[PDB]
A paper describes a structure:
The function of such enzyme, L-cysteine desulfidase CyuA, which catalyzes L-cysteine decomposition to pyruvate, ammonia, and hydrogen sulfide, remains incompletely understood. Crystallographic and biochemical data reveal that MmCyuA binds a [4Fe-4S] cluster coordinated by three conserved cysteines; the fourth ligand is a nonconserved cysteine in the wild-type enzyme but is replaced by glycerol or ethylene glycol in a variant. Each monomer in the asymmetric unit was constituted by a N-terminal structural domain (residues 24–145), formed by a central antiparallel β-sheet surrounded by α-helices, and a mostly helical C-terminal structural domain (residues 157–378). We showed that, after anaerobic cluster reconstitution, MmCyuA can bind one [4Fe-4S] cluster per subunit, which was essential for cysteine desulfidase activity.
Attempts were made to co-crystallize holo-MmCyuA with the competitive inhibitor serine (10 mM). Crystals of holo-CyuA with MES were grown by mixing 1 µL of protein and 10 mM L-serine with 1 µL of a 500 µL reservoir solution containing 14% PEG 4000, 0.1 M MES pH 6.5, 0.1 M NaCl, 0.1 M MgCl2. The crystals, obtained also in space group P212121, diffracted at 2.4 Å resolution and possessed two molecules in the asymmetric unit (crystal 2), which differed by the orientation of the N-terminal domains relative to the catalytic domains. The structure was solved by single wavelength anomalous diffusion (SAD) using data collected near the Fe K-edge on Crystal 2. The anomalous maps from data recorded near the iron K-edge energy were best fitted with a [2Fe-2S] cluster bound to the four cysteines (Cys287, Cys289, Cys329 and Cys336), with an occupancy of 90%. In both molecules, the electron densities observed near the cluster did not fit with a serine molecule and were instead attributed to 2-(N-morpholino)ethanesulfonic acid (MES) in molecule A and to a chloride ion in molecule B, both present in the crystallization solution at a concentration of 100 mM. Thus, the structure corresponding to Crystal 2 was named [2Fe-2S]-CyuA + MES. The presence of two different ligands near the active sites of molecules A and B leads to slightly different positioning of the clusters. The sulfonate group of MES and the chloride ion were located at the same anion binding site occupied by the sulfate ion in the holo-MmCyuA structure. After freezing and storage in liquid nitrogen in sealed tubes, the [4Fe-4S] cluster displayed degradation, as shown by the poor activity and [Fe-S] content of the protein, as well as the [2Fe-2S] state of the cluster observed in Crystal 2.
Author numbering:
A (entry chain A): 1 to 149, 153 to 283, 286 to 356, 362 to 378
B (entry chain B): 2 to 152, 157 to 280, 286 to 355, 362 to 384
The structure:
């Protein structure tokens, strides 16, 4: 029950659980374009956007919220219309302009590079003035312009990646008030993404998990005007960490107290797995699904360390596809596979590590 | 028209065979039997060299007709069996507890990090030496030099066939092939014993439960054979069991079952010829195609969509955990094959998909 640990986990939770309107690809472009703070978008002579291929491929299939359009072009226009103070909720309240879209299309150049996360914007004005913007790395830090920080150090995340599973189990038993509100907002937000049926096999627990997870994932993908609660700057890791648990709870006890603790443990595990991991390819399901299998195991078996280690082991052995196909449906399919692996891991015991910590570290080593 | 019928029929008779135990123990038994020792009690030393990709998948596998698990009883079973039986070497053996204890004192196991390898070296109480070697794939007997029994240009022609060719073949099946398909259905249905992965009752959870149950029956070493496809019993289970379970859950059409099972076997052999493990990537492709034919008939647009979705939702490929890891991979294969029949998007068509999965399995094999 150390109070130093409680403040460290709280700061990391407040830093890694954030709202994002639209998928990372379009939202990141919109935020980077808004950071240039152009007063008159019609006074622009040239706009060059530099994106890495790893991320931003599949941006063509992503709906930009409040535009009724898909891809990079509407995301740039949306950024010119949005406010940088909104961060990844930049598309909120924007009034899409078809006039600005056609104006920008005949002025937009896209440069694609082969590198980790990168989103740079360079803009030439009709008066010679230049404006630059830059968001970099999977932690989405604004490099250009220099902004005031809520300020997690490298040593802080190093301390968190040395914590044990028991530390997260203790934390969920005495959750701060501010974190209870955050978890409840996460549950509400990600449950609101459930709309039309995407993959409904039956009425049982597993199919409700698959159907609700794939439905929330499709709602984001099509460009609906619903924010999502992302975990470690990934809206997919957010859905994967929360929706299989929200659906499991709906199919079982409908216990709001158990749901808060299981969702929180899942987010804590998802951040932990992300911090231990190195990026090169996807990981939404290997990290978010590990949070889900642990969170589901806590809902099902309580504070049982022998059960938790057995679910981590079975999940690591039944790990889904390394590479995601992308496109309009790829992520939804991987997330449905993640549901199956996380759910089925709660019924098989193996003999891939010897415990939760060794399992997360093993999945980290396979990222080569 | 009739040239294709004879080619397909010969390949069907050559690739659909009975197998008693799992490949790991059966391969050891066959390699030990290839030394053809007259008196097993006249042996001074036995060294078995195995690659790790098959050693780890053998430490808990039951050896048929022994009531024991692992490498030691498989070697003893090989000393008792006949090399003319190949993959059915453990058939009819009379296990000797005296020979087991005798051999345990003289047996050395060397483990190497390489593709499939199973070598046996034996020193006689008279100084004479006897060597055996199977490598790359079971039945590839390098030492001793043997005449080629089962049948490169025939497989090359079959590798160039279209999906339509298999759809035509299942509409006018020879009598000898209908008996083979019925024997395959009976044999693999007989492996279903105790429930392994329940999930209640649904078409999907029935497929999962029956597939994982048949796998567990083989894994524990029961003296009941399996119908293997391109050798490998796991590939036979994956190609047949999900279809047998789907048929039991929806209608009970024996005619549609025969055609769907046959198409699945035809696709499974095709995918194998167009090539590491791949039990689920090849057998599961046969299953999704066979299930799609049961569900939609001779519809090429549906079949193309089923292969595309399966290729995008492709399971693990690299199986860890152990022997239970195979049952988990086959349960994941059930989910991917079943769910692929409800989502439309990869290759673009069946042929491009089989060729694509083949290219990615090579990349996974180059990791180690
Ligand atoms: S990009 Fe991660 S699941 Fe698709
Ligand atoms: S060896 Fe093929 S699924 Fe395990
Ligand atoms: Cl096998």
């Amino acid at each position: 029950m150390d109070d130093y640990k409680r403040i460290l986990i709280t700061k990391i939770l407040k830093n890694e659980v954030t709202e994002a309107l639209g998928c990372t690809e379009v939202g990141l472009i919109g935020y980077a374009v808004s950071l240039c703070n152009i007063s008159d978008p019609f006074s622009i002579e040239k706009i060059e956007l530099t994106l890495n291929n790893g991320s931003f491929k599949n941006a063509y299939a992503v709906g930009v919220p409040n535009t009724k359009k898909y891809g990079i072009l509407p995301a740039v226009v949306g950024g010119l219309l949005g406010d940088h103070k909104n961060k990844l909720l930049v598309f909120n309240g924007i009034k899409y302009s078809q006039k600005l879209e056609d104006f920008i299309k005949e002025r937009l150049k896209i440069r694609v590079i082969n590198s980790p996360l990168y989103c740079g914007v360079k803009i030439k004005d009709n008066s010679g003035n230049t404006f630059e913007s830059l968001i970099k790395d999977n932690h989405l830090n604004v490099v250009i312009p220099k902004i005031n920080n809520s300020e997690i150090n490298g040593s802080e995340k190093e301390e968190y990646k040395n914590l044990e599973l028991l530390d997260f189990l203790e934390y969920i038993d005495e959750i701060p008030e501010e974190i209870i509100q955050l978890v409840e907002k996460t549950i509400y937000t990600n449950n609101n993404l459930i709309k039309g049926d995407f993959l409904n096999f039956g009425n049982d627990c597993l199919s409700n998990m698959v159907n609700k997870t794939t439905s929330a994932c499709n709602t984001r993908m099509i460009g609906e005007n619903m924010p999502a609660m992302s975990v470690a700057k990934s809206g997919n890791m957010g859905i994967m960490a929360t929706l299989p648990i929200i659906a499991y709870d709906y199919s079982n006890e409908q216990n709001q107290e158990k749901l808060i603790k299981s969702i929180l443990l899942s987010v804590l595990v998802t951040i932990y797995a992300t911090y231990k991991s190195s990026y090169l390819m996807c990981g939404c399901v290997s990290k978010g699904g590990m949070g889900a299998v642990i969170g589901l195991c806590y809902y099902k078996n309580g504070k049982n360390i022998k059960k938790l280690d057995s679910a981590a082991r079975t999940f690591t052995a039944n790990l889904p596809g390394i590479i995601c196909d992308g496109g309009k449906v790829g992520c939804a399919l991987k997330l449905a596979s993640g549901c199956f692996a996380a759910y089925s891991s709660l019924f098989v015991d193996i003999s891939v590590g010897k415990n939760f910590k060794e399992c997360v570290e093993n999945i980290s080593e396979i990222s080569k």
